[PDB]
Amino acid sequence: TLLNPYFGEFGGMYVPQILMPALNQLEEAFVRAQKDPEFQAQFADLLKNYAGRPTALTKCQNITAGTRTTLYLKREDLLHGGAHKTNQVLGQALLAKRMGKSEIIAETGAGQHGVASALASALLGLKCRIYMGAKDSPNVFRMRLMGAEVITLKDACNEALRDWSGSYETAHYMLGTAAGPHPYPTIVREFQRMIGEETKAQILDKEGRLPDAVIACVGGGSNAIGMFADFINDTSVGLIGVEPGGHGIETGEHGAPLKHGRVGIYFGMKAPMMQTADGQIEESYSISAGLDFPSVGPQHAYLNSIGRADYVSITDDEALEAFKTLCRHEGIIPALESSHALAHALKMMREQPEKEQLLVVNLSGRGDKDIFTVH
Amino acid sequence: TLLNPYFGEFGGMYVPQILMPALNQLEEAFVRAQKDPEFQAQFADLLKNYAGRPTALTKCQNITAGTRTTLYLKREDLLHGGAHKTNQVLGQALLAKRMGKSEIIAETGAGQHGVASALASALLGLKCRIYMGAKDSPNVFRMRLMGAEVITLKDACNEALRDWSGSYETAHYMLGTAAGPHPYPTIVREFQRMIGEETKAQILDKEGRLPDAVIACVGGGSNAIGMFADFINDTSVGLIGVEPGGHGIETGEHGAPLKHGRVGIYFGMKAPMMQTADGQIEESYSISAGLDFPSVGPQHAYLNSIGRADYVSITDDEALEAFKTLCRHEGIIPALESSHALAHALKMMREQPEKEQLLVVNLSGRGDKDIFTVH
Amino acid sequence: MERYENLFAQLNDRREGAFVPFVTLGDPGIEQSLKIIDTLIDAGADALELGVPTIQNANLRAFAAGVTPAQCFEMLALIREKHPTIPIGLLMYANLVFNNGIDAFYARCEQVGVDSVLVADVPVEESAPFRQAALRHNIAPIFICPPNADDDLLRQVASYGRGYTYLLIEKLKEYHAAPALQGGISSPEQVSAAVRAGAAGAISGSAIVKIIEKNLASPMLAELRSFVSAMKAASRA
Amino acid sequence: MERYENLFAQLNDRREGAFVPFVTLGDPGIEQSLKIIDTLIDAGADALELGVPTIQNANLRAFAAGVTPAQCFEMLALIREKHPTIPIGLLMYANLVFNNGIDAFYARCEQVGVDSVLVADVPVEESAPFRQAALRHNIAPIFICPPNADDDLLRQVASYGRGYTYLLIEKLKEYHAAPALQGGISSPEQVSAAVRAGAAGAISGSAIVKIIEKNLASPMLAELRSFVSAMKAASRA
Numbered sequence A, B: 001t002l003l004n005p006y007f008g009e010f011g012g013m014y015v016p017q018i019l020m021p022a023l024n025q026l027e028e029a030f031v032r033a034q035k036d037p038e039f040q041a042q043f044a045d046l047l048k049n050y051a052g053r054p055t056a057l058t059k060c061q062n063i064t065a066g067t068r069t070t071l072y073l074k075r076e077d078l079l080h081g082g083a084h085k086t087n088q089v090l091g092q093a094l095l096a097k098r099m100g101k102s103e104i105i106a107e108t109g110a111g112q113h114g115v116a117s118a119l120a121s122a123l124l125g126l127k128c129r130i131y132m133g134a135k136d137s138p139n140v141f142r143m144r145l146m147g148a149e150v151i152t153l154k155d156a157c158n159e160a161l162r163d164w165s166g167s168y169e170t171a172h173y174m175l176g177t178a179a180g181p182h183p184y185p186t187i188v189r190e191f192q193r194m195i196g197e198e199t200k201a202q203i204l205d206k207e208g209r210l211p212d213a214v215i216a217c218v219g220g221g222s223n224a225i226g227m228f229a230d231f232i233n234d235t236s237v238g239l240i241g242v243e244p245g246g247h248g249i250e251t252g253e254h255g256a257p258l259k260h261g262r263v264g265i266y267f268g269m270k271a272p273m274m275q276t277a278d279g280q281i282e283e284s285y286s287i288s289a290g291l292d293f294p295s296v297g298p299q300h301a302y303l304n305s306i307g308r309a310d311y312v313s314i315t316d317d318e319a320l321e322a323f324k325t326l327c328r329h330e331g332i333i334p335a336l337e338s339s340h341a342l343a344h345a346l347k348m349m350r351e352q353p354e355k356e357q358l359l360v361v362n363l364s365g366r367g368d369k370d371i372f373t374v375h
Numbered sequence C, D: 001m002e003r004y005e006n007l008f009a010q011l012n013d014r015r016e017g018a019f020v021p022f023v024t025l026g027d028p029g030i031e032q033s034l035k036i037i038d039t040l041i042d043a044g045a046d047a048l049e050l051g052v053p054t055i056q057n058a059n060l061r062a063f064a065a066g067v068t069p070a071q072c073f074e075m076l077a078l079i080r081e082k083h084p085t086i087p088i089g090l091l092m093y094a095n096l097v098f099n100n101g102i103d104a105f106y107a108r109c110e111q112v113g114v115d116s117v118l119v120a121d122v123p124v125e126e127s128a129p130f131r132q133a134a135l136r137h138n139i140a141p142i143f144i145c146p147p148n149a150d151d152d153l154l155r156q157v158a159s160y161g162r163g164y165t166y167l168l169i170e171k172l173k174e175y176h177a178a179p180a181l182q183g184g185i186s187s188p189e190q191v192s193a194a195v196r197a198g199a200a201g202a203i204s205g206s207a208i209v210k211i212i213e214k215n216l217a218s219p220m221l222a223e224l225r226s227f228v229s230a231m232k233a234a235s236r237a
């Protein structure tokens, strides 16, 4: 391969031989695009005039009141689609095109991805077929409406992989997060790296100083790593990832394999996972289905291994509260998934009010979708 | 008064004497703020880092394919709240503050405004009470959640006016559109004028030439006039307003008083209205409740009188189609209200494909709210 | 217009205040209202305050009684037919008087026997068209003078007004404003309270409308008889 | 490992191809599977292809039969207990063999009597750990050789592989790759088709699994008896 399919001991390409050529072709197509000023130009242009980039950096001044910590917010919810997802999905599509693809393959549980793919497909004109199980509504319609072809997850991931296996010549696979087999993990990060880059330049302007720490929820790690990336080299600023603790780690009904899983081999990669005592892959509970990935990004497992990044957790109630709080004090409705992250920042300041800290959480999306449930 | 409460023969301050001092105070507070570089600074700043401004100008390239007309789109849906409303609501709030107000009064039918007010109230910390009737859901919760105090329209407008009448000393009234009595019509335009200003600069960049025409739907005229304003002096570019034709003008079940109403006196203003043969105010049908205002902006009635602006109409089916079309060809879901406007542009090009025209419609909002119905 | 003048004449020659009871036209329905007014009148009422479709419920009530803007002018004539002296006031909103021409309306008013008209939504700052058209057809344009009043507002209502002022009492007099009429009167105490206060009389708004809705199923009149009688007696001196 | 060698010896001394039928371990449940294999074996089967929990339904079936990774190794030993010669192949996924140590797994394999193991998700590019650990414990690491094969891929599977190649036939031989075994075989025609094609034999995947699910309520064996018998006869020569 051209790139390093491994982040420490996490990563690899654990997929049937049949899919290796597909993957090899993809890394070649990516390494090429990566250096093409044109590809960049379009992607950048598309991000700009269609998606909405750059995203604003709102500075919360009400919730922090009473404490000595300033909370900045990265408005990934002010982006077309209302979620960071509709970001890398474009670059992948552009990639699919550069490769000569005429169709897109994807899957989803809630539909958040099924939409991004659909919306990205429609604009770029690509035949897109999404895979959904029983969790299958407002998006099924949303997806179909957008031309998409609606057809657990680990299972839904197989069907997808199966399909692609025999068709990759024309159809391309759109991984939903920064997980899966190489070079996906590396691809989705690059197509989500502007988030941190913008965050850096922005904060540098508003406070001529880098943040103390940057919090970001983690379902697969795509949004998290998107924010982290450009700050890795900046040792001063800390990186905090937040996994869904569900009803509580000590209850077993949670979703934080990164810190309570156990490295295994599935999803074409080698990283921490939610599995039984003898190797059976399991689920990951959380109020926000947008965070039900029973695994995590290999670069996240590695970043935490060398202690470069700290990963904490947050239960349902914690997020549910941080959710209502944002509404009432900032007039912003965050995604139950995004809450988790913001919910940790609150605790961070609440526990040490006299503590002077300038942190910024990543708001990966709006909460309009979780309004029904949170209700 | 300091300003001109009249646009030709349309306008005025037809409200009980009791409310005159309130109005007089408001115009004074506005004329003052208008020239305060600070007030501007904040408003601008708030618009920027909180709401999302500037809004992108997406250039549709798929729907126009097959014809000689380029369709540009003003992404008012990429704004916090997913509608142009969450724009003037801020400046009004800032105004309320500058005046010393601690509470906000408002009303709504669907809730679109009730939210903007709520969201604007919360951020600026103002006690807000919205008035709703029976049409009263996802927003009632959305509103309450945001601290708002949930309590027809012409009727709902009275209750509101009644309240304010005896309390204006502390509470301020937040008109929902560019209608009502002076200086509201003039106020809401100024707090919605950046839309066109941005549109001008943007198009001037993308095509170093002003648009041929600018389409915008009209429920009250706030979004329309927001887009029109900065182009009025530009005689070359045409201004097209689109009122909801409902089931069809010839059916009586429509909502276009501007061109099929009859000047009357209500809502504290003198302009076209939906009334019976002997003066009784009526309703205005349309699939999009966000366009059920039985009247219109006096400056719109005047602009059309001197023939400066052209106003057309569009039925439900027309919008319903222009709706699904945007989804499938641009991956964008527009508001059923915004459809109407875009639905006219389509017809404009469909009828004369060989016709070379560069027009831009105003997308006042996302369609996520109308997804249930359109379904 | 001169009707009010007359009323404030004999009323003074008796050192007593005026008691004008308000009510919605054709509220209960039509024949009942035509009666309520009859009673209100012989009950003691000096003037009249008829509104065209609590007060809210009054409208809702009337409405559900098929009361078109034409059905009232019928009553207005009928009423005037039996009572040529009692002054009649009309409460309206711009659109109604604006609907089919401003003058046409006022002209129709002089035709039925209306004396004064007050447009609830027409401030002194936008009454010109209504003022002139009213004067032209010999109709007293009544303007409301609220609490948050001014000096200029006080001067405007005293100059533009006529028939009577809808309520200071010293300045309104100093300015020469038509006999001010105070209008939260529900008890005889307030009636005499105003008279002594300086007001040429008082008006009982919804106050009487209630008595009509608290007996909707019991054609009430006796209650109006007394209620008014009382109120009236309180004005005497 | 040497078990396969032996099989491909007597098999050649009879100028006949090998017929390895695949099936899910403890599919129907446990005792039934322990039987199906018994039959498959005496029916004619030369080798064996046992997968650990159409094929999908096979898993779903077994699962609902309480078949833990420990319950199979029990069967693997039992089976081997009665059949010391027939080679046994295992179909697994990285995580399972990785779970409780890679070596530990392979070591347990040599302990039960397994001959070859193929990890469906372990490409030649990430098999080192699995390859060595397999060889170390005398286990033939079977690698799949698909259609979109290469020259290097052909060279890699011929060098790293052992026991037999999971299927060109000329290059695989030129490279010295363990006897290639072709595996879409459902009719005796394809069986003999492969033999003649150059393949040392064929494998009937789900092909046989169906016969097991199309009689789920009728303990079927007779169908497997014949189905296999046929398939086998087709390989003879």
Ligand SMILES: *Cc1c(COP(=O)(O)O)cnc(C)c1O
Binding pocket: A082, A083, A084, A085, A112, A176, A177, A178, A217, A218, A219, A220, A221, A222, A223, A224, A290, A291, A335, A337, A338, A363, A364, A365, A366
């Ligand atoms: C999809 C989604 C996530 C989960 O994404 P990662 O791949 O874990 O970054 C988090 N927040 C929102 C709003 C999402 O839509």
Ligand SMILES: *Cc1c(COP(=O)(O)O)cnc(C)c1O
Binding pocket: B082, B083, B084, B085, B112, B176, B177, B178, B217, B218, B219, B220, B221, B222, B223, B224, B290, B291, B335, B337, B338, B363, B364, B365, B366
């Ligand atoms: C509220 C709304 C409108 C109607 O607003 P005007 O005052 O008529 O501009 C139109 N489109 C959207 C998306 C709206 O939210």
Ligand code: NA
Binding pocket: A218, A219, A220, A243, A255, A256, A257, A284, A291, A292, A293, A294, A295, A296
């Ligand atoms: Na996860």
Ligand code: NA
Binding pocket: B218, B219, B220, B243, B255, B256, B257, B284, B291, B292, B293, B294, B295, B296
């Ligand atoms: Na309208």
